[PDB]
Every structure is written in C-alpha cells, then in structure tokens.
Amino acid sequence: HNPVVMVHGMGGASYNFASIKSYLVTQGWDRNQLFAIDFIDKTGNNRNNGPRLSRFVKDVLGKTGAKKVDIVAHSMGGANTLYYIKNLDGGDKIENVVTLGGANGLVSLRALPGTDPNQKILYTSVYSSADMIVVNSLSRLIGARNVLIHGVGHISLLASSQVKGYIKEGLNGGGQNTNLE
Numbered sequence: 001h002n003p004v005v006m007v008h009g010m011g012g013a014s015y016n017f018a019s020i021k022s023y024l025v026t027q028g029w030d031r032n033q034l035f036a037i038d039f040i041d042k043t044g045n046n047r048n049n050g051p052r053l054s055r056f057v058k059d060v061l062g063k064t065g066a067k068k069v070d071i072v073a074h075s076m077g078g079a080n081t082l083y084y085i086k087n088l089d090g091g092d093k094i095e096n097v098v099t100l101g102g103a104n105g106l107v108s109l110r111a112l113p114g115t116d117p118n119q120k121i122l123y124t125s126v127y128s129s130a131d132m133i134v135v136n137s138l139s140r141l142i143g144a145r146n147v148l149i150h151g152v153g154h155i156s157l158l159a160s161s162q163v164k165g166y167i168k169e170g171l172n173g174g175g176q177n178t179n180l181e
C-alpha cells in the first residue's frame with residue numbers, strides 16, 4: 001500500500017479521520033503509513049491549504065521513500081486536493097484519490113489524470129443523497145467512479161461502514177479515470 005494522506009474539510013481536524021484510521025488498520029494498513037493533516041485555515045481557502053498540502057505530501061514522501069501517496073478527502077478537502085493536482089506540484093505524486101462528500105466542483109468537475117504518463121490518477125467520489133451540506137452536483141466527477149449512497153449524513157460519512165468499504169476499494173486500486181490523458 002502507498003502511504004495515505006487524509007485531508008479534512010471546513011471546520012475540520014485530523015481527528016475527524018479517527019474511525020477511518022481504525023477501520024483501515026483492521027483491514028491490513030499499517031498505522032505508521034496513515035497520515036492526517038491539520039490545516040491552519042479552517043475555512044478551506046486554496047491559497048492557504050493548497051501549499052500546506054503540497055508540503056505535507058512532500059514530507060510524507062521524504063520520510064517513507066514511497067513514489068506516490070493516496071488521498072482520502074472530506075468535503076472541502078476534495079477541492080483542496082484537486083487544486084494541488086491542477087495548479088501546484090501534485091500531478092505526479094498521487095495514485096489513488098477517494099473523496100467523501102467532496103466539494104470538488106469548486107475547483108474541477110473532471111477527474112484530473114495528472115502528469116505521470118505511466119499512471120493516471122484514479123478517483124472514487126462517494127456522496128450521499130442525505131447530505132445537507134454539499135449538494136451532490138459538486139461531488140460527482142466526470143471520469144471517476146461515482147458512488148451514490150442514501151440515508152447517511154455529511155458527518156456520518158466519516159463513520160459509516162458502507163462508506164469505509166468504498167474507501168478500501170479505492171485505496172486498493174478500484175477507482176477509475178476514463179478521461180483522456
């Protein structure tokens with residue numbers, strides 16, 4: 001497995017991912033390869049969070065020696081991740097992306113393939129018809145594996161067993177990117 005970088009949303013914190021971390025450890029990920037960022041700007045502005053994410057990923061690669069990271073992102077964390085890929089230095093550093101209720105369309109409505117010609121970035125976008133915070137048209141990405149679930153609220157995306165199964169599938173290479181390179 002690649003190291004996993006977990007990216008919180010507006011008003012969030014690294015401890016938002018505590019239950020997802022516990023799940024992944026019981027499914028075979030090493031606790032020492034799971035990394036969750038804490039942004040300073042809790043309002044989610046890309047001009048702050050994009051560069052902070054860039055440096056965090058650089059640090060993770062430097063301390064693990066991995067070639068690429070995988071990303072799990074919640075709400076505005078999805079937009080921050082896409083900004084890093086689109087405008088900054090993330091195009092060749094990411095393999096698998098999973099967004100949970102992502103506010104992705106504030107940056108892109110396309111699953112951006114990145115810049116490694118040997119390997120397109122693969123995406124799973126999970127969103128819920130019961131999400132009262134992020135409308136689903138912001139979460140769906142053309143070219144991704146888009147997964148619509150029902151009955152789970154925006155915060156419960158971080159606890160739901162059904163959501164965790166899709167995270168596992170995405171981190172094991174089960175996302176998609178059917179866009180052109």
Ligand SMILES: O=C([O-])CC(=O)C(=O)O
Binds near residue numbers: 058
């Ligand atoms: O694009 C690159 O590989 C250079 C880079 O990540 C950085 O400036 O830290």
